[PDB]
Amino acid sequence: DRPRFSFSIAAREGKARTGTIEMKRGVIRTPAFMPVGTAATVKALKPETVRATGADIILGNTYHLMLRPGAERIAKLGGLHSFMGWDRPILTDSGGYQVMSLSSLTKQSEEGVTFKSHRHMLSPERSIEIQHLLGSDIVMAFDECTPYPATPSRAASSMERSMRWAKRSRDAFDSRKEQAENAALFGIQQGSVFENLRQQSADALAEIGFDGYAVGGLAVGEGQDEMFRVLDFSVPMLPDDKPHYLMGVGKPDDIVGAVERGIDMFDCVLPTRSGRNGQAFTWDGPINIRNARFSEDLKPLDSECHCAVCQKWSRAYIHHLIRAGEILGAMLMTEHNIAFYQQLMQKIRDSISEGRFSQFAQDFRARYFA
Amino acid sequence: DRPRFSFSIAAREGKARTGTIEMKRGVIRTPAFMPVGTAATVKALKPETVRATGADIILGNTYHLMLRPGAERIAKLGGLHSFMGWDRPILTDSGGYQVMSLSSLTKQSEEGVTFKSHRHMLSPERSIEIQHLLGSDIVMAFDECTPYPATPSRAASSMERSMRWAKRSRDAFDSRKEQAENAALFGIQQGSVFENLRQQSADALAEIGFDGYAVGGLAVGEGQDEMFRVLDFSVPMLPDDKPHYLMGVGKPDDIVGAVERGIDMFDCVLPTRSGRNGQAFTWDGPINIRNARFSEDLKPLDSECHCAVCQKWSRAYIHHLIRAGEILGAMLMTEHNIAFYQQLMQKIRDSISEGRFSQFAQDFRARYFA
Ligand SMILES: CNc1nc2c(CCNCC3CCCC3)c3nc(N)[nH]c(=O)c3cc2[nH]1
Ligand SMILES: CNc1nc2c(CCNCC3CCCC3)c3nc(N)[nH]c(=O)c3cc2[nH]1
Ligand SMILES: [Cl-]
Ligand SMILES: [Cl-]
Ligand SMILES: [Zn+2]
Ligand SMILES: [Zn+2]
């Protein structure tokens, strides 16, 4: 039987790593892309389809689920895995990021955040409890994602609060025997774009001790150049022997560059959200299938993609479906986009394992941006 | 290799029949339920899923497809079968019924109907041509579905026009060698609720000669009692050795009673349309999954249904999905409802084959309306 949590690194190239996370509910191949759910579902896909694309783990949506149908109700029905029919690992975010981005009126304090549903409270203790009620396998500490840009003073005060909340998250998780024995807990580094604050945050998280370490506070408007600059110094501050999770990233080129900088795990709504809006990812860059140039194009979305959509249906058909507002259009676009992301991760893993990831990154960028 | 068209009756009980239609693209078990597409898709289902529910044939949507993406374009892309990925028989309606129900401004004449898209003309010749361009296997004659109620004079004039159009449909179909050799053509009986007009229409259609005969002009507001009364005298007027197709019907109890009256084929948007709106069919009658009573119900939609939805997911989960507006909710409701309809048809076929259909009908009604 698998352990509660074990991360093993099988091969390395520069800062990039490939390996596996073993958990009770399954193995996660890294670098990993984790598709993101909306309301106990990955949009427009059955769980068997999500698995068929190559996903080893998905994200649940703590913020949506605590409001509807409610975390207690999901627990009463047997937990999120049973409820939605996904029996493999699930990671849950801690909810505050989405509260601060989506909620109408927020009130923040040392205790947590109160907010009005689009009233509810969210504290480190309540966040960990909700994630337990959902039955999450990878639990995120409750943090504050500092807005960008932030002054050094405000970034420091925010990061300091997040580190106090990280300790409260650790203690809440450890107090609950079933959660501590069966799930894993990740800490989230903050500190905005400032190296000294990123270092203080990394040091605080390592002193507490976590199963994995996320880089928080990025993909919040700073742009790729700045994100990469912050990753350059921030990832080496985290424990080398634990997974590194870049939250909310990102486009294919963001993922490649982040792996070059030591990131092992990614989540992003982009492939699911933008597929419904007509954007399809291809090795030659994204296309918008709604464009009239595809109305009679009999080729698949991408000429090399191995997914079931590209084996069966044409650009012309999917163009028509999306233009007509048909549900099958969203289903096919979403399956292809998630499958494309998984094929990207597989090429990344294979190229690191073979010591040719730097060349893969160069070749990928030349063709994707040609 | 299968013939162009062969209908064989394997067993009979009273007016009910069970058997098969063999066509080049597959066998159709009768009595048959034919799921209805919207715009080159059966809503929210891949074709493989439609087939998995038990469907042997589906309906294309001539009215929608002639407007978008256009019949000529579909032909240029290889036909509707290739375009949507369904390789089995497709029946297409002739388009006038939907024009008269959906179009904003209509102008009717002996030549056909002109209308504005929500300008285009539709005549017997153009209707048959569009169905050819789509690559339909079962082509419907171009008719006029008389509004209900209709005076005897107006019903007669309308039926007479439909019979002239039926002859024009026959000749257009026969002129096109590839269509005549590979597809089948059905005539449509009209005459409103009037026995003498139904008889004149049946006689006119039999003189022309068709591969199958539809009962048109019903399910247009007359209610089940009146529909059944008209079927009682109308179905025996059609050739016994050809299939009898009741257009646009219907609810499960409508289907059972129509089979008792000699109907072999059915199409209806109800299972697809109403599933998206939360109505699920069960052997104990329909339920609305949005009702709060299902919020914590761990049972499947129906306790006996063999479909994949009822094997995996609970009422509580589907309730949540539909309340949340999630695409997966529509997917699961639609798959279950179409599968339920196919299981109904299978029970009908098996009970006729075993000489116990009358008992099945009685048992079905007692439980469905309990
Ligand atoms: C898109 N950019 C971005 N996302 C971030 C996220 C959310 C990652 N995605 C989670 C899913 C969203 C819907 C359900 C869960 C962040 N989350 C936390 N806790 N902290 C961040 O600093 C944090 C930072 C992030 N930046
Ligand atoms: C719902 N009631 C009803 N439908 C009838 C229909 C349409 C059957 N359904 C076809 C699908 C609808 C969307 C795409 C094809 C009828 N069609 C014709 N041609 N004539 C009728 O008298 C006729 C009569 C009908 N009565
Ligand atoms: Cl969340
Ligand atoms: Cl039509
Ligand atoms: Zn693909
Ligand atoms: Zn079912």
Ligand 5 centroid to Cα of residue A165, in Å, is 42
For A207-266, give the secondary structure using H, E and C.
HHCCCEEEECCCCCCCCHHHHHHHHHHHHHHCCCCCCEEECCCCCHHHHHHHHHCCCCEE
Q: Is A328 on the interface with B (CB under 8 A)?
A: yes
How many whole angstroms separate alpha carbon A31 and alpha carbon B335? 35
CATH of B1-370, one of 3.20.20.105, 1.10.3720.10, 3.40.50.150, 3.30.1950.10: 3.20.20.105
Q: B355 CA to chain A: closest CA distance, Å?
A: 40
The answer to whether B268 is annotated as binding is no
How many whole angstroms separate alpha carbon B136 and alpha carbon B130? 9
Angle CA B249–B252–B257, to nearest 5:
75
Beta bridge pairs of residue A291: none
Using an 8 Å Cβ cutoff, are A214 and A185 in contact?
Answer: no
Beta bridge pairs of residue A316: none
Mutate which of B68, B145, B230 for ligand 2 pocket (most atoms within 8 A of beta carbon): B145
Using an 8 Å Cβ cutoff, are B42 and B64 in contact?
Answer: no
Residue A188 beta carbon below 6 angstroms from any ligand 1 atom: yes
Q: At what angle do helices A252-260 and A224-234 cross, to 10 degrees?
A: 20
Residue type, B149: P
Mutate which of B103, B247, B265 for ligand 2 pocket (most atoms within 8 A of beta carbon): B247
Question: What is the sign, positive or negative, of the torsion defined by CA atoms of A35, A36, A42, A44?
Answer: negative
Q: What are the backbone dihedrals phi and psi of residue B24, each rounded to the nearest 5 degrees, phi first? A: -60, -40
Closest residue by Cα to residue B313 from A247, A313, A84: A84
What are the boundaries of each domain within chain B?
Answer: 1-370
Closest residue by Cα to residue A186 from A216, A211, A159: A211
For residue A151, what are the contacts with CB-CB under 8 A and spacing of at least 6?
A: none
Ligand 3 centroid to Cα of residue A99, in Å, is 8
Helix, strand, coil: what percent of chain B each, to 5? 45, 15, 35
How many whole angstroms separate alpha carbon B336 and alpha carbon B280? 8
Alpha helix (H) residue ranges in chain A: 47-52, 62-67, 71-76, 80-84, 96-102, 124-134, 152-175, 177-182, 195-208, 224-234, 252-260, 270-276, 308-312, 315-323, 327-353, 357-368
Resolution (A): 1.5
Tell me which long-range contacts A180-184 makes (C-beta under 8 A, separation of at least 24). A181/A4, A182/A4, A182/A24, A182/A137, A183/A4, A183/A131, A183/A132, A183/A136, A183/A137, A183/A138, A183/A139, A184/A4, A184/A5, A184/A23, A184/A137, A184/A138, A184/A139, A184/A211, A184/A212
How many whole angstroms separate alpha carbon B151 and alpha carbon B367? 38
Residue type, B51: R
- A335: which 2 tokens? 């399956």
Expt. technique: X-ray
How many whole angstroms separate alpha carbon A188 and alpha carbon B58? 52
Using an 8 Å Cβ cutoff, are A296 and B77 in contact?
Answer: yes
Q: What are the backbone dihedrals phi and psi of residue A126, each rounded to the nearest 5 degrees, phi first? A: -70, -35
* DSSP string computed for A11-48: EEETTEEEEEEEETTEEEEESEEE-B-SSSS-TT--HH
